[PDB]
Motif scaffolding. Sequence first.
Motif, PDB file in Angstrom:
ATOM      1  N   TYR A 146       0.853  -1.185   0.000  1.00 42.63           N
ATOM      2  CA  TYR A 146       0.000   0.000   0.000  1.00 42.63           C
ATOM      3  C   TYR A 146       0.895   1.243   0.000  1.00 42.63           C
ATOM      4  CZ  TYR A 146      -4.233   2.615   1.558  1.00 42.63           C
ATOM      5  OH  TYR A 146      -5.380   3.363   1.714  1.00 42.63           O
ATOM      6  N   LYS A 191      -1.453  -7.848   4.627  1.00 36.97           N
ATOM      7  CA  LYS A 191      -2.786  -7.316   4.858  1.00 36.97           C
ATOM      8  C   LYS A 191      -3.307  -6.710   3.557  1.00 36.97           C
ATOM      9  CE  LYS A 191      -4.623  -5.177   9.150  1.00 36.97           C
ATOM     10  NZ  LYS A 191      -4.067  -4.589  10.426  1.00 36.97           N
ATOM     11  N   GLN A 192      -2.504  -5.837   2.963  1.00 41.05           N
ATOM     12  CA  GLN A 192      -2.872  -5.180   1.718  1.00 41.05           C
ATOM     13  C   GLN A 192      -2.918  -6.115   0.498  1.00 41.05           C
ATOM     14  OE1 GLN A 192      -4.157  -2.230  -0.758  1.00 41.05           O
ATOM     15  NE2 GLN A 192      -4.026  -2.322   1.474  1.00 41.05           N
ATOM     16  N   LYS A 195      -6.413  -7.237   0.212  1.00 42.84           N
ATOM     17  CA  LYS A 195      -7.329  -6.237  -0.313  1.00 42.84           C
ATOM     18  C   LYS A 195      -7.298  -6.183  -1.828  1.00 42.84           C
ATOM     19  CE  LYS A 195      -7.586  -3.767   3.949  1.00 42.84           C
ATOM     20  NZ  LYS A 195      -6.762  -3.082   4.978  1.00 42.84           N
ATOM     21  N   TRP A 210     -16.840  -6.386   2.842  1.00 45.75           N
ATOM     22  CA  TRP A 210     -15.795  -6.460   3.853  1.00 45.75           C
ATOM     23  C   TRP A 210     -15.625  -5.107   4.544  1.00 45.75           C
ATOM     24  CZ3 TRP A 210     -10.932  -5.404   5.880  1.00 45.75           C
ATOM     25  CH2 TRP A 210     -10.417  -6.429   6.689  1.00 45.75           C
ATOM     26  N   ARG A 214     -16.310  -4.240   8.498  1.00 38.55           N
ATOM     27  CA  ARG A 214     -15.203  -3.762   9.317  1.00 38.55           C
ATOM     28  C   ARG A 214     -15.479  -2.373   9.888  1.00 38.55           C
ATOM     29  NH1 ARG A 214     -12.962  -3.100  12.555  1.00 38.55           N
ATOM     30  NH2 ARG A 214     -10.795  -2.954  13.271  1.00 38.55           N
ATOM     31  N   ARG A 218     -15.936  -0.703  13.713  1.00 44.40           N
ATOM     32  CA  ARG A 218     -15.173   0.418  14.247  1.00 44.40           C
ATOM     33  C   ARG A 218     -16.056   1.582  14.647  1.00 44.40           C
ATOM     34  NH1 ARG A 218     -10.338   0.763   9.969  1.00 44.40           N
ATOM     35  NH2 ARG A 218      -9.007  -0.889  10.849  1.00 44.40           N
ATOM     36  N   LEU A 234     -13.570   4.769   0.181  1.00 40.94           N
ATOM     37  CA  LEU A 234     -12.518   3.817   0.557  1.00 40.94           C
ATOM     38  C   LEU A 234     -12.209   2.833  -0.560  1.00 40.94           C
ATOM     39  CD1 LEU A 234     -10.585   2.933   2.534  1.00 40.94           C
ATOM     40  CD2 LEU A 234     -12.356   1.758   3.838  1.00 40.94           C
ATOM     41  N   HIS A 238      -8.491   2.139  -2.740  1.00 39.84           N
ATOM     42  CA  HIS A 238      -7.839   0.850  -2.885  1.00 39.84           C
ATOM     43  C   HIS A 238      -7.908   0.303  -4.299  1.00 39.84           C
ATOM     44  CE1 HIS A 238      -6.404  -0.130   1.111  1.00 39.84           C
ATOM     45  NE2 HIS A 238      -7.455   0.510   1.589  1.00 39.84           N
ATOM     46  N   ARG A 253      -6.890   9.275  -0.851  1.00 39.92           N
ATOM     47  CA  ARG A 253      -6.766   8.800   0.522  1.00 39.92           C
ATOM     48  C   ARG A 253      -6.701   9.988   1.466  1.00 39.92           C
ATOM     49  NH1 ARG A 253      -2.291   6.329   4.572  1.00 39.92           N
ATOM     50  NH2 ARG A 253      -3.634   4.718   5.510  1.00 39.92           N
ATOM     51  N   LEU A 256     -10.050  11.608   1.908  1.00 40.54           N
ATOM     52  CA  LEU A 256     -10.866  10.784   2.791  1.00 40.54           C
ATOM     53  C   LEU A 256     -10.496  11.020   4.246  1.00 40.54           C
ATOM     54  CD1 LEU A 256     -13.005   8.792   3.264  1.00 40.54           C
ATOM     55  CD2 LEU A 256     -11.440   6.921   2.714  1.00 40.54           C
ATOM     56  N   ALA A 257      -9.220  11.296   4.485  1.00 37.49           N
ATOM     57  CA  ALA A 257      -8.747  11.556   5.834  1.00 37.49           C
ATOM     58  C   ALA A 257      -9.305  12.901   6.262  1.00 37.49           C
ATOM     59  CB  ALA A 257      -7.236  11.596   5.854  1.00 37.49           C
ATOM     60  N   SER A 283      -3.385   9.751   8.700  1.00 36.20           N
ATOM     61  CA  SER A 283      -3.890   8.658   7.875  1.00 36.20           C
ATOM     62  C   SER A 283      -3.657   7.292   8.532  1.00 36.20           C
ATOM     63  CB  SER A 283      -3.235   8.687   6.485  1.00 36.20           C
ATOM     64  OG  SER A 283      -3.827   9.685   5.663  1.00 36.20           O
ATOM     65  N   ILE A 286      -6.134   6.885  11.887  1.00 39.29           N
ATOM     66  CA  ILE A 286      -7.538   6.559  11.715  1.00 39.29           C
ATOM     67  C   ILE A 286      -7.697   5.147  11.189  1.00 39.29           C
ATOM     68  CG2 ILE A 286      -9.626   7.051  10.418  1.00 39.29           C
ATOM     69  CD1 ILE A 286      -8.782   9.914  10.230  1.00 39.29           C
ATOM     70  N   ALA A 287      -6.784   4.771  10.305  1.00 38.67           N
ATOM     71  CA  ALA A 287      -6.785   3.456   9.686  1.00 38.67           C
ATOM     72  C   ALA A 287      -6.678   2.324  10.702  1.00 38.67           C
ATOM     73  CB  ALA A 287      -5.646   3.388   8.688  1.00 38.67           C
ATOM     74  N   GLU A 288      -6.063   2.605  11.847  1.00 41.06           N
ATOM     75  CA  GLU A 288      -5.898   1.595  12.898  1.00 41.06           C
ATOM     76  C   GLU A 288      -6.574   1.973  14.217  1.00 41.06           C
ATOM     77  OE1 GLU A 288      -2.342  -0.757  12.847  1.00 41.06           O
ATOM     78  OE2 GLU A 288      -3.193  -0.938  10.830  1.00 41.06           O
TER      79      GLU A 288
HETATM   80  C1  OPB Z   1      -7.664   8.391   7.245  1.00 39.15           C
HETATM   81  C2  OPB Z   1      -8.039   7.872   5.833  1.00 39.15           C
HETATM   82  C3  OPB Z   1      -7.466   6.382   5.799  1.00 39.15           C
HETATM   83  C4  OPB Z   1      -8.221   5.524   4.731  1.00 39.15           C
HETATM   84  C5  OPB Z   1      -8.052   3.982   5.017  1.00 39.15           C
HETATM   85  C6  OPB Z   1      -9.040   3.124   5.808  1.00 39.15           C
HETATM   86  O1  OPB Z   1     -10.045   3.446   6.345  1.00 39.15           O
HETATM   87  N1  OPB Z   1      -8.523   1.869   5.796  1.00 39.15           N
HETATM   88  C7  OPB Z   1      -9.374   0.685   5.729  1.00 39.15           C
HETATM   89  C8  OPB Z   1      -9.981   0.209   6.945  1.00 39.15           C
HETATM   90  C9  OPB Z   1     -10.797  -0.940   6.890  1.00 39.15           C
HETATM   91  C10 OPB Z   1     -11.012  -1.608   5.687  1.00 39.15           C
HETATM   92  C11 OPB Z   1     -10.433  -1.155   4.494  1.00 39.15           C
HETATM   93  C12 OPB Z   1      -9.594   0.015   4.509  1.00 39.15           C
HETATM   94  N2  OPB Z   1      -7.241   1.838   5.028  1.00 39.15           N
HETATM   95  C13 OPB Z   1      -6.223   0.892   5.419  1.00 39.15           C
HETATM   96  C14 OPB Z   1      -5.537   0.187   4.494  1.00 39.15           C
HETATM   97  C15 OPB Z   1      -4.515  -0.778   4.837  1.00 39.15           C
HETATM   98  C16 OPB Z   1      -4.228  -0.991   6.207  1.00 39.15           C
HETATM   99  O2  OPB Z   1      -3.283  -1.905   6.525  1.00 39.15           O
HETATM  100  C17 OPB Z   1      -4.908  -0.285   7.149  1.00 39.15           C
HETATM  101  C18 OPB Z   1      -5.900   0.653   6.814  1.00 39.15           C
HETATM  102  C19 OPB Z   1      -6.962   3.114   4.559  1.00 39.15           C
HETATM  103  O3  OPB Z   1      -5.959   3.428   3.878  1.00 39.15           O
END
Ligand code: OPB
Length: 578
Positions: A146, A191-192, A195, A210, A214, A218, A234, A238, A253, A256-257, A283, A286-288
């Motif tokens: 990614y 992980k990626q 996707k 998916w 997910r 969250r 999202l 991807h 991306r 979206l953030a 970025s 939020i993603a985690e």
């Molecule tokens: C702040 C804007 C971030 C946008 C974003 C998101 O919500 N997830 C995301 C979260 C859940 C399912 C699909 C994508 N992924 C993401 C991709 C790879 C990874 O290992 C972690 C997270 C993203 O890049």
Amino acid sequence: SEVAHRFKDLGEENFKALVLIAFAQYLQQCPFEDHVKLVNEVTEFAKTCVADESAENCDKSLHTLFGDKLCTVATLRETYGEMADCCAKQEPERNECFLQHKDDNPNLPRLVRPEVDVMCTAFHDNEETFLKKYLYEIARRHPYFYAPELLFFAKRYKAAFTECCQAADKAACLLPKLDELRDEGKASSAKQRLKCASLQKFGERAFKAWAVARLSQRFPKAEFAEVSKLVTDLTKVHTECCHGDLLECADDRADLAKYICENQDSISSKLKECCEKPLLEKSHCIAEVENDEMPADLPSLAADFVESKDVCKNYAEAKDVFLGMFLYEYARRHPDYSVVLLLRLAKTYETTLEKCCAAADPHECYAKVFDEFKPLVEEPQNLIKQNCELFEQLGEYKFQNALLVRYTKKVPQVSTPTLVEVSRNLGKVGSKCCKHPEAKRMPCAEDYLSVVLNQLCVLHEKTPVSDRVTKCCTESLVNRRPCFSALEVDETYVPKEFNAETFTFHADICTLSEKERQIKKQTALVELVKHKPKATKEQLKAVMDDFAAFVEKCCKADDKETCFAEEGKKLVAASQAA
Ligand SMILES: CCCCC1C(=O)N(c2ccccc2)N(c2ccc(O)cc2)C1=O
């Protein structure tokens, strides 16, 4: 102009990084120098487009520009044989050719790293070429990594050296942080890679479900109409990153953030800390982010999905929207379920409405659907409870070996290297999840396994040797883990025949790290099981226990490494006996 567009948005730094990564991912065998040159030639051009938005070919799509650039070195088949063909193609897909030619297991030599004294020097002298080289090596070894995240890993990588080279004990300060990154990076890639696999082999409708599940986990408070909005954006992000449109992926991306931070109050309450920092960090944050607390008073699912009399009606009106809401409603109140179990329930729900709604009396038919969920839910629970207990008594190494024997008997055709790699990863679930509360165990374990298993699937797809892997991999994305668990031991496999060299002995093994030492032992065990599938139970110790004795007696001996050629002949004699 488009190249101008992305330049203004990303800036010089990121714009240069991303293109390097893009180039590195396409021509993984091409040397660092050449990529740099092209990247620059490509960057210079961009600069002119900014001023004059119609200069040369500034009007073109990144596809044509990037494509031709690479093709100035790809036509060199003596280096990249099968590539030249790609360049002789046109617009609609001179790219699909490239995408299709990414190697998930490049024949690139191991990447050993120089003493802490050199890295710091090379880093300090030229901080730019140092980092550029990093991305190059990573993106060329992980063609699906990614991109937007790789930049994040880069910023940290830098900070590692920026601080550690200024310590009292650099090797002490660096080494750790560097290991920690090497791991986290490999994970983020796996992980990626999933996707992209989802989108590419199953379609976007698959990736979407998916996402909904997910995200709904969250952001429980988030309303369906909001989630959908996040899922839609999202997805595109991807979709672009996987097709190789890195620049737009990085742009979208970011947007979206931005959005997610603006409407914080409408999505999650744990987003705060994320929105108070640098983009790239924002970025990755939020993603985690952890799931928000569950909305207090929530009605029961049975209400609108099994008890209501309009079910079938609504299902007919907008089935996709109906099922999406079902998933969303079931996931928000179930963060203790894995994303794939949720998608399984959803699939079981849809299959039911399908047959039920065309019945003489629906309500009566789909009235006991939740009764068929019970099995589906417990299966993973028991699997996890069982495999964690075992893991606990055997430790990671012994547990991994178990899985080695197990999977090798399941699909013996698979190449030993792959079986070893996969098995090991599968065993790392123990330490990674077993130490969790049952409430967080399932989503941790089973979703991790979906990653590991896809690795085996992509690797396999390169050279398919087992139809059994082909089936489980291709039949259902969501059912892969259960599909593999169901396999026992191939009854059609015909035992391999012994021939020394298959497993060579060279004394060179006495220098490799402790890890690569275990690895050599495991690679042995696999080769053993392939030669004696049946005769084996736990008599699978009578040789390895002795296999240990073997190794212990030739690295320590004063002999010139001859014992290795001689002795190795003695244990083989004992082994066969058992
Ligand atoms: C702040 C804007 C971030 C946008 C974003 C998101 O919500 N997830 C995301 C979260 C859940 C399912 C699909 C994508 N992924 C993401 C991709 C790879 C990874 O290992 C972690 C997270 C993203 O890049």
